[PDB]
């Protein structure tokens, strides 16, 4: 949110991640929420985001916190002409 | 000459107490420091080579020797006898002054100088440095630095070995 208020994130995603407290990477989580932000809690998980046709995985690191999830799951398989 | 006085007074006891020499004439001693600047583009126009000669002069107070090819290489349109860059050989008080200028001015003045390689040896006690980027002290005359080319800076010693050379340069000031 570009308003200086709650950095947006979905309740179920927050809930499942916070339940995953031991931070095991095998605890891979899925979501259709391309619109949520990224937090330090996410840093180190392999989440799978629905890109319109598939759950594409992505491993989070420090360089994603201010970004959205949909930025790492593109929707257009362009390959030149 | 501060560096030479250091070499005589502080280095040599601090060196021999470790390396266990039965005579002071086993001491590692810096015999010379060579500068080189290869250009190649001089084959296009050697005015840049004249410029490199100018900068070596401004740096050292010592006219360089223009090197030349002993071969012709069609891959670079290179002909034997044509001037590939220049070199200088410092020995003595001038050499010590140059090294002290390096350590005390122009190694910090690189943008990200956190140190230098320790493995850059020949396996026989002689060091080889390389400036990738010119303009490392104020009298490089930034107003006319057309291009940054770089330098090879060889530091020759009487050191038998990597270890002798490394410890010597440590006591002399080189921040490994």
């Amino acid at each position: 949110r570009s308003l200086k208020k709650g950095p947006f994130v979905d309740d179920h995603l927050m809930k499942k991640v916070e339940a995953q407290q031991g931070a095991e990477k095998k605890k891979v989580i899925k979501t259709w929420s391309r619109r949520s932000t990224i937090f330090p809690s996410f840093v180190g998980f392999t989440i799978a985001v629905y890109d319109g046709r598939k759950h594409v995985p992505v491993y989070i690191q420090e360089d994603m916190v201010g970004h959205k999830l949909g930025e790492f799951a593109p929707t257009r398989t362009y390959r030149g002409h | 000459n501060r560096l030479k006085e250091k070499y005589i007074k502080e280095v040599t006891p601090s060196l021999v107490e470790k390396f266990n020499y039965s005579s002071v004439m086993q001491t590692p001693k810096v015999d010379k420091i060579v500068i080189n600047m290869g250009v190649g583009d001089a084959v296009s126009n050697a005015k840049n080579l004249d410029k490199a000669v100018e900068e070596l002069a401004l740096i050292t107070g010592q006219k360089p020797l223009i090197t030349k090819a002993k071969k012709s290489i069609a891959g670079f349109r290179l002909r034997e006898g044509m001037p590939i860059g220049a070199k200088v050989t410092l020995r003595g008080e001038r050499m010590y002054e140059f090294l002290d200028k390096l350590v005390t001015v122009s190694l910090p003045r690189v943008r990200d100088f956190h140190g230098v390689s320790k493995k850059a040896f020949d396996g026989r006690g002689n060091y080889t440095l390389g400036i990738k980027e010119q303009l490392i002290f104020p009298e490089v005359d930034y107003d006319l630095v057309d291009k940054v080319r770089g330098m090879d800076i060889v530091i020759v010693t009487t050191a038998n070995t990597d270890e002798e050379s490394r410890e010597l340069l440590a006591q002399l000031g080189m921040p490994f």
Binding site: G66 | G61, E97, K101, T104, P108, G173
Partner: protein
Amino acid sequence: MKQDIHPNYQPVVFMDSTTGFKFLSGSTPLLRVEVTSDSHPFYGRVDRFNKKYGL
């Protein structure tokens, strides 16, 4: 040292006013120097997200 070919190589002083260090050596008398061995040290997005939105 030959004549008429070498630049004038005169004893000059290098001064770090950051630490006041004073060194003598020959070059082409006092000169201005910013940093040196006696003044150089070697001789984030999570934090930023937290600063922007307190957590």
